């Protein structure tokens, strides 16, 4: 059976199943999936470009721009000029956004800990290191 | 930075980046992403339910049903009654579909081998085993 060990299918199924579990929690706390992805991606971060945010949230750039229009209207994020290049808009989470998502982030950590507990610390760390290395090799 | 080591974000980014690389090849061979996902998921498989196909292709069931309507019209797949329960439709790839996707599947194997080569056989096998175990623990 081709798909049983095919890496892209394994990554896609694992990603969807784990993410869907936490998205239920996010929505019961009043967050859309994309709002949660943006705020979690910006929390504890220096300002990053719209393109970087689109990559780390796995969201198309025009979609991200529309999302930021409304999240900025609500005071949860702020767009800023890049200090040097003007073709570049940076974005950051505001204090309002951070306080809004703080509790959800703790719940997200608890859920991740539950997901990784059966694998043990060594296998969990190996998985995260491999995923990080793969991202850094394949990002454009 | 919360998102740098957050498992769902790592899985989602790795999945998207690797998949996007191969989707380019699929489209240059005349396949849509969803057509490729269905045919690759059915290749070498016994007939599976529409729900199982939706899970393994990470596609909503109504979307899968519409896709199968047109792929069955083109003779690439076939829907069948389940032998016992009638609330269940099974689906299989036809010989026409298998021959259509054979070369693409070889290219997919070559691409996966390229993606996994820098990690070595041990780390690649560890990744695939962990992903498989996670899927089997979280599928419903």
Short mmCIF file of C-alpha atoms in Angstrom, two decimals:
data_model
loop_
_atom_site.label_atom_id
_atom_site.label_comp_id
_atom_site.label_asym_id
_atom_site.label_seq_id
_atom_site.Cartn_x
_atom_site.Cartn_y
_atom_site.Cartn_z
CA UNK A 1 0.00 0.00 0.00
CA UNK A 2 1.73 3.16 -1.27
CA UNK A 3 0.19 5.64 1.14
CA UNK A 4 0.89 3.70 4.36
CA UNK A 5 4.53 4.85 4.55
CA UNK A 6 4.53 7.87 2.19
CA UNK A 7 6.10 10.77 4.14
CA UNK A 8 3.86 13.62 2.83
CA UNK A 9 0.72 11.64 3.63
CA UNK A 10 2.04 10.77 7.10
CA UNK A 11 2.88 14.40 7.86
CA UNK A 12 -0.46 15.66 6.55
CA UNK A 13 -2.55 13.18 8.53
CA UNK A 14 -0.60 13.63 11.77
CA UNK A 15 -0.80 17.42 11.40
CA UNK A 16 -4.53 17.46 10.74
CA UNK A 17 -5.46 15.07 13.53
CA UNK A 18 -3.44 16.86 16.23
CA UNK A 19 -4.44 20.33 15.06
CA UNK A 20 -8.13 19.46 14.89
CA UNK A 21 -8.00 18.40 18.53
CA UNK A 22 -6.73 21.78 19.61
CA UNK A 23 -8.89 23.83 17.23
CA UNK A 24 -11.95 22.67 19.17
CA UNK A 25 -10.51 24.27 22.30
CA UNK A 26 -9.61 27.44 20.43
CA UNK A 27 -13.14 27.86 19.10
CA UNK A 28 -14.73 27.22 22.49
CA UNK A 29 -12.52 30.10 23.73
CA UNK A 30 -13.85 32.38 20.95
CA UNK A 31 -10.90 32.16 18.53
CA UNK A 32 -10.99 31.20 14.91
CA UNK A 33 -8.29 28.80 13.75
CA UNK A 34 -6.55 31.51 11.73
CA UNK A 35 -6.75 34.06 14.56
CA UNK A 36 -5.19 31.51 16.91
CA UNK A 37 -2.49 30.62 14.36
CA UNK A 38 -1.52 34.29 13.90
CA UNK A 39 -1.47 35.18 17.58
CA UNK A 40 0.41 32.01 18.58
CA UNK A 41 2.92 32.62 15.76
CA UNK A 42 3.54 36.20 16.93
CA UNK A 43 3.60 35.57 20.71
CA UNK A 44 7.04 36.19 22.16
CA UNK A 45 8.31 37.27 18.73
CA UNK A 46 10.01 40.33 17.37
CA UNK A 47 8.11 41.86 14.42
CA UNK A 48 8.21 39.60 11.36
CA UNK A 49 7.32 40.19 7.74
CA UNK A 50 3.92 39.37 6.28
CA UNK A 51 5.62 36.72 4.14
CA UNK A 52 7.24 35.09 7.17
CA UNK A 53 3.91 35.11 9.03
CA UNK A 54 2.23 33.51 6.00
CA UNK A 55 4.84 30.77 5.94
CA UNK A 56 4.76 29.97 9.67
CA UNK A 57 0.92 29.96 9.75
CA UNK A 58 0.70 27.97 6.49
CA UNK A 59 -1.66 30.63 5.07
CA UNK A 60 -1.62 32.32 1.67
CA UNK A 61 -0.31 35.88 1.82
CA UNK A 62 -3.51 37.58 0.50
CA UNK A 63 -5.51 35.64 3.08
CA UNK A 64 -3.09 36.76 5.81
CA UNK A 65 -3.41 40.37 4.71
CA UNK A 66 -7.22 40.28 4.98
CA UNK A 67 -6.95 38.59 8.38
CA UNK A 68 -4.55 41.24 9.63
CA UNK A 69 -6.89 43.98 8.39
CA UNK A 70 -9.53 42.77 10.77
CA UNK A 71 -7.21 41.73 13.64
CA UNK A 72 -5.56 45.17 13.52
CA UNK A 73 -9.00 46.80 13.58
CA UNK A 74 -9.59 44.86 16.83
CA UNK A 75 -6.24 45.97 18.25
CA UNK A 76 -4.80 42.45 18.51
CA UNK A 77 -1.89 43.01 16.07
CA UNK A 78 -0.05 45.94 14.55
CA UNK A 79 1.54 46.36 11.13
CA UNK A 80 4.71 48.47 10.95
CA UNK A 81 7.08 49.69 8.24
CA UNK A 82 10.31 47.78 7.78
CA UNK A 83 13.20 49.98 8.87
CA UNK A 84 15.07 49.68 5.55
CA UNK A 85 13.07 48.09 2.72
CA UNK A 86 9.61 49.53 2.06
CA UNK A 87 8.34 46.64 0.01
CA UNK A 88 8.24 44.95 3.45
CA UNK A 89 5.56 45.28 6.12
CA UNK A 90 6.33 43.88 9.56
CA UNK A 91 3.68 42.65 11.99
CA UNK A 92 3.60 42.12 15.76
CA UNK A 93 1.15 41.01 18.43
CA UNK A 94 -0.07 43.75 20.77
CA UNK A 95 -0.40 43.47 24.53
CA UNK A 96 -4.17 43.15 24.06
CA UNK A 97 -3.64 40.19 21.72
CA UNK A 98 -1.13 38.54 24.05
CA UNK A 99 -3.43 38.85 27.06
CA UNK A 100 -6.30 37.56 24.92
CA UNK A 101 -4.41 34.39 23.97
CA UNK A 102 -2.36 33.73 27.16
CA UNK A 103 -4.70 31.13 28.67
CA UNK A 104 -5.21 29.40 25.31
CA UNK A 105 -1.43 29.15 24.94
CA UNK A 106 -1.20 27.39 28.29
CA UNK A 107 -3.92 24.97 27.18
CA UNK A 108 -1.98 24.44 23.94
CA UNK A 109 1.15 23.52 25.90
CA UNK A 110 -0.86 21.08 28.04
CA UNK A 111 -2.37 19.47 24.94
CA UNK A 112 1.04 19.15 23.26
CA UNK A 113 2.41 17.56 26.44
CA UNK A 114 -0.44 15.03 26.36
CA UNK A 115 0.23 14.26 22.67
CA UNK A 116 3.95 13.72 23.26
CA UNK A 117 3.83 11.93 26.63
CA UNK A 118 3.37 8.36 25.23
CA UNK A 119 6.49 8.76 23.07
CA UNK A 120 8.89 9.76 25.82
CA UNK A 121 11.16 12.77 25.99
CA UNK A 122 13.83 11.34 23.68
CA UNK A 123 11.49 10.44 20.82
CA UNK A 124 9.54 13.69 21.24
CA UNK A 125 12.71 15.78 21.03
CA UNK A 126 13.91 13.74 18.04
CA UNK A 127 10.62 14.40 16.24
CA UNK A 128 10.74 18.15 16.92
CA UNK A 129 14.38 18.40 15.83
CA UNK A 130 13.73 16.52 12.60
CA UNK A 131 10.69 18.65 11.78
CA UNK A 132 12.63 21.86 12.47
CA UNK A 133 15.55 20.72 10.30
CA UNK A 134 13.17 19.78 7.47
CA UNK A 135 11.42 23.17 7.62
CA UNK A 136 14.69 25.05 7.56
CA UNK A 137 15.89 23.02 4.59
CA UNK A 138 12.71 23.46 2.55
CA UNK A 139 11.55 27.00 3.30
CA UNK A 140 12.03 29.56 0.53
CA UNK B 1 9.14 32.23 20.89
CA UNK B 2 6.09 29.97 21.35
CA UNK B 3 5.75 28.79 17.77
CA UNK B 4 9.39 27.75 17.24
CA UNK B 5 8.96 24.40 19.04
CA UNK B 6 5.15 24.00 19.03
CA UNK B 7 4.43 20.51 17.61
CA UNK B 8 1.27 21.35 15.58
CA UNK B 9 3.02 24.29 13.92
CA UNK B 10 6.08 22.16 13.16
CA UNK B 11 3.97 19.40 11.62
CA UNK B 12 1.90 21.84 9.58
CA UNK B 13 4.89 23.71 8.16
CA UNK B 14 6.87 20.56 7.35
CA UNK B 15 3.82 19.01 5.70
CA UNK B 16 3.05 22.05 3.57
CA UNK B 17 6.60 22.64 2.41
CA UNK B 18 7.24 19.03 1.36
CA UNK B 19 3.81 18.59 -0.21
CA UNK B 20 4.04 21.82 -2.18
CA UNK B 21 7.27 20.59 -3.75
CA UNK B 22 5.60 17.48 -5.07
CA UNK B 23 2.32 19.16 -6.06
CA UNK B 24 4.23 21.11 -8.71
CA UNK B 25 5.25 17.82 -10.31
CA UNK B 26 1.73 16.45 -10.06
CA UNK B 27 0.24 19.46 -11.84
CA UNK B 28 2.85 19.39 -14.60
CA UNK B 29 1.73 15.78 -15.17
CA UNK B 30 -1.92 16.91 -15.47
CA UNK B 31 -3.14 15.94 -11.97
CA UNK B 32 -4.85 18.14 -9.47
CA UNK B 33 -3.63 17.85 -5.89
CA UNK B 34 -6.85 16.15 -4.78
CA UNK B 35 -6.87 13.75 -7.74
CA UNK B 36 -3.28 12.78 -6.91
CA UNK B 37 -4.11 12.38 -3.20
CA UNK B 38 -7.05 10.07 -3.97
CA UNK B 39 -5.24 7.91 -6.50
CA UNK B 40 -2.08 7.63 -4.38
CA UNK B 41 -4.22 6.75 -1.33
CA UNK B 42 -6.03 4.00 -3.24
CA UNK B 43 -3.04 2.53 -5.12
CA UNK B 44 -2.26 -0.98 -3.96
CA UNK B 45 -5.24 -0.88 -1.59
CA UNK B 46 -8.28 -3.03 -1.06
CA UNK B 47 -11.53 -1.03 -1.30
CA UNK B 48 -11.90 1.41 1.60
CA UNK B 49 -14.83 3.43 2.86
CA UNK B 50 -15.47 7.03 1.81
CA UNK B 51 -14.80 8.05 5.42
CA UNK B 52 -11.44 6.27 5.47
CA UNK B 53 -10.48 7.88 2.15
CA UNK B 54 -11.46 11.29 3.53
CA UNK B 55 -9.26 10.74 6.57
CA UNK B 56 -6.18 9.49 4.69
CA UNK B 57 -6.43 12.30 2.08
CA UNK B 58 -7.15 14.94 4.75
CA UNK B 59 -10.26 16.01 2.80
CA UNK B 60 -13.78 16.71 4.04
CA UNK B 61 -16.20 13.91 3.21
CA UNK B 62 -18.60 16.04 1.06
CA UNK B 63 -15.60 17.30 -0.90
CA UNK B 64 -14.41 13.71 -1.39
CA UNK B 65 -17.85 12.67 -2.62
CA UNK B 66 -17.90 15.41 -5.29
CA UNK B 67 -14.35 14.49 -6.32
CA UNK B 68 -15.29 10.83 -6.66
CA UNK B 69 -18.33 11.78 -8.75
CA UNK B 70 -16.05 13.24 -11.36
CA UNK B 71 -13.19 10.72 -11.02
CA UNK B 72 -15.68 7.86 -11.42
CA UNK B 73 -17.12 9.57 -14.50
CA UNK B 74 -13.56 9.48 -15.91
CA UNK B 75 -13.16 5.80 -15.01
CA UNK B 76 -10.28 6.36 -12.59
CA UNK B 77 -12.08 5.05 -9.48
CA UNK B 78 -15.11 2.93 -8.69
CA UNK B 79 -17.58 3.12 -5.82
CA UNK B 80 -19.01 -0.19 -4.56
CA UNK B 81 -21.54 -1.31 -1.94
CA UNK B 82 -20.17 -2.54 1.35
CA UNK B 83 -20.84 -6.26 1.64
CA UNK B 84 -22.69 -5.98 4.98
CA UNK B 85 -23.56 -2.42 6.03
CA UNK B 86 -25.34 -0.27 3.45
CA UNK B 87 -24.68 3.04 5.12
CA UNK B 88 -21.14 2.37 3.81
CA UNK B 89 -19.81 2.97 0.30
CA UNK B 90 -16.41 1.51 -0.56
CA UNK B 91 -14.09 2.97 -3.19
CA UNK B 92 -11.19 1.56 -5.21
CA UNK B 93 -8.79 2.71 -7.91
CA UNK B 94 -9.34 1.18 -11.35
CA UNK B 95 -6.65 -0.15 -13.65
CA UNK B 96 -7.03 3.01 -15.75
CA UNK B 97 -6.37 5.15 -12.67
CA UNK B 98 -3.38 3.04 -11.60
CA UNK B 99 -1.78 3.21 -15.05
CA UNK B 100 -2.49 6.95 -15.12
CA UNK B 101 -0.63 7.55 -11.85
CA UNK B 102 2.16 4.90 -12.05
CA UNK B 103 4.89 7.22 -13.31
CA UNK B 104 3.89 9.99 -10.89
CA UNK B 105 4.13 7.49 -8.02
CA UNK B 106 7.69 6.65 -9.04
CA UNK B 107 8.52 10.36 -9.10
CA UNK B 108 6.91 10.67 -5.66
CA UNK B 109 9.15 7.92 -4.29
CA UNK B 110 12.22 9.63 -5.78
CA UNK B 111 11.21 12.96 -4.23
CA UNK B 112 10.61 11.36 -0.82
CA UNK B 113 14.01 9.69 -1.04
CA UNK B 114 15.61 13.08 -1.74
CA UNK B 115 13.76 14.65 1.22
CA UNK B 116 14.86 11.90 3.61
CA UNK B 117 18.42 11.33 2.37
CA UNK B 118 20.09 14.06 4.52
CA UNK B 119 18.60 12.55 7.69
CA UNK B 120 19.90 9.03 7.22
CA UNK B 121 17.96 5.78 7.26
CA UNK B 122 17.69 5.57 11.06
CA UNK B 123 16.25 9.06 11.58
CA UNK B 124 13.98 8.70 8.54
CA UNK B 125 12.55 5.42 9.83
CA UNK B 126 12.15 6.91 13.32
CA UNK B 127 10.20 9.84 11.87
CA UNK B 128 7.88 7.59 9.84
CA UNK B 129 7.27 5.27 12.80
CA UNK B 130 6.44 8.15 15.12
CA UNK B 131 4.08 9.73 12.60
CA UNK B 132 2.32 6.39 12.01
CA UNK B 133 1.95 5.79 15.76
CA UNK B 134 0.56 9.31 16.26
CA UNK B 135 -1.98 8.86 13.46
CA UNK B 136 -3.15 5.54 14.81
CA UNK B 137 -3.54 7.02 18.29
CA UNK B 138 -5.49 10.08 17.16
CA UNK B 139 -7.69 8.85 14.33
CA UNK B 140 -11.40 8.50 15.10
#
